Design a protein around this ligand. Structure first.
Ligand SMILES: C#CCN(Cc1ccc2[nH]c(N)nc(=O)c2c1)c1ccc(C(=O)N[C@@H](CCC(=O)O)C(=O)O)cc1
Ligand SMILES: C#CCN(Cc1ccc2[nH]c(N)nc(=O)c2c1)c1ccc(C(=O)N[C@@H](CCC(=O)O)C(=O)O)cc1
Ligand SMILES: *c1cc(=O)[nH]c(=O)n1[C@H]1C[C@H](O)[C@@H](COP(=O)(O)O)O1
Ligand SMILES: *c1cc(=O)[nH]c(=O)n1[C@H]1C[C@H](O)[C@@H](COP(=O)(O)O)O1
Lengths: 264, 264
């Protein structure tokens, strides 16, 4: 996608060499933002083939409140295996904070239902936020959240969303986060009888791994294709009731996949 | 400053009329970012005069872990007075979160000591974050944090920082915020023996109140003047030991102030 390919070029044109936790070495910039108008097409990268199957299942798992990879496993998604313990648990990550953030006084707050109530009854609120960054539980989490926080906004019957990603693996991680949160905006909007607006992505440490540079340049030599279209075949009674079978991507003709190693 | 005035113009050209909480009316956009190179000067507005004594006393109050306005009163600062109860308490806002985030089991995490140690022991970290967005205690706070989140970053021995502001009043709150966070980056850099980098400001709902339109137009005709220089006259033993006396602002020659009503 043009916006994505421009960021890769920016990391490469004005980035600094930084070392990191995984020992690998990164090229890095701090602070970046980009906007995708959802009405132009579903923002799934076309310069390398993406696997949408895993994006969809990971999101439905999140909305269940689940932090154990069993569900993903019975759906043949292995993207979180490396971080899971012996029992498949990842600790209180995303799904637990979204559906049941713990308070000091014994309650648990379901940030996804409160947000949905807010978009229906108070869509002009400036507080329609969901946070995964729970300071007091980070130590129990297998990996600290990279998509730490997000915010919805309504204008002219359109629902927009801004994500703040604290750390970003541009080659591997960013195609996943863009499609996952664009898919969430479509579901939310359907349930609140809104039209979709903009997905806005803001990054903290935005970086390219040293062992992904050849792949990055191969990708940068491609022209973007026209964006695919998302058709949801059913309107569930609640956002927690969507199924994989309800989503259909059409008009997706991507460039061949490019493989590259993950850093654990 | 050039980029502040360019955002004021952007809001006036593209803003949507939204009816907000107080019933005044805002013109707003969603999603905006600005970079400020701190080597180039302290980003204090010169198209109107701001007062640093509130900016400095409020930050020092924050790092103290205090949420009661008595200190502010003793130092002639009135900025928070409308939101404080009969006893002067604001409830568990910034000060409580920054120095004693309440974990579910009754412990407390001192986010600024953590951040200090991370900058001195693991500066390449992509997790150097302080959060004021404590979902479990939001109902107890007199007003939900507008400055919700910020992340530090170190590259080439320079300290950068990005702030996420969920809701912004471009006219009053935004000059305050930029100076407040540029000050904290200078204090942190002094205590960690680092040089200063960039302040990145990312906002959610960025707006102009309808009853500030005249005042905005006055400000948009003034030409920005050279930025000031911040001189910290004493290196204290710790980040919690600074005093108001220690800071001086050279070269500040603003245009006269513009008075404008606050919306409660
Ligand atoms: C974000 C997120 C979730 N995650 C979690 C996650 C956790 C830690 C990370 N760590 C690092 N260094 N980079 C990452 O992108 C990353 C991603 C992902 C995990 C794996 C793949 C991956 O291996 N990419 C393959 C996927 C193949 C498939 O889906 O079947 C690819 O083809 O690109 C992508 C996302
Ligand atoms: C940021 C922040 C904290 N805050 C808190 C705070 C709380 C609620 C708000 N509500 C609204 N509608 N706008 C705000 O900017 C706002 C700010 C501030 C409070 C007052 C001023 C203010 O009135 N500015 C005067 C200061 C004059 C002085 O005493 O020196 C000015 O005109 O410059 C700024 C910031
Ligand atoms: C974290 C998870 C995700 O969904 N997307 C990402 O881009 N990442 C990346 C960031 C970094 O490369 C690594 C996480 O480790 P760290 O805490 O940033 O050091 O995976
Ligand atoms: C909050 C605090 C600050 O430092 N700066 C700000 O601009 N504000 C503004 C945002 C909004 O105009 C109002 C807070 O109310 P709301 O929760 O956004 O509705 O003060």
């Amino acid at each position: 996608m043009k916006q994505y390919l421009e960021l890769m070029q920016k990391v490469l044109d004005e980035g600094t060499q930084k070392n990191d936790r995984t020992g690998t070495g990164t090229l890095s910039i701090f602070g970046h933002q980009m906007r995708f108008n959802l009405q132009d097409g579903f923002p799934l990268v076309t310069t390398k083939r993406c696997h949408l199957r895993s994006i969809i299942h990971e999101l439905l798992w999140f909305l269940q409140g689940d932090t154990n990879i069993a569900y993903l496993h019975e759906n043949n998604v292995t993207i979180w295996d490396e971080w899971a313990d012996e029992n498949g648990d990842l600790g209180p990550v995303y799904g637990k904070q979204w559906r049941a953030w713990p308070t000091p006084d014994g309650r648990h707050i379901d940030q996804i239902t409160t947000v949905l109530n807010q978009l229906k009854n108070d869509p002009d609120s400036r507080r329609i936020i969901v946070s995964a960054w729970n300071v007091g539980e980070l130590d129990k989490m297998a990996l600290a959240p990279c998509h730490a926080f997000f915010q919805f906004y309504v204008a002219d019957g359109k629902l927009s969303c801004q994500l703040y990603q604290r750390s970003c693996d541009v080659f591997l991680g960013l195609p996943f986060a863009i499609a996952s949160y664009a898919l969430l905006v479509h579901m939310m909007a359907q349930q609140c009888d809104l039209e979709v607006g903009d997905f806005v992505w803001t990054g903290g440490d935005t970086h390219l791994y040293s062992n992904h540079m050849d792949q990055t340049h191969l990708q940068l030599s491609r022209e973007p294709r026209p964006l695919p279209k998302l058709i949801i075949k059913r309107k569930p009674e609640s956002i927690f009731d969507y199924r994989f079978e309800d989503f259909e991507i059409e008009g997706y003709d991507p460039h061949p996949g490019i493989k590259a190693p993950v850093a654990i």
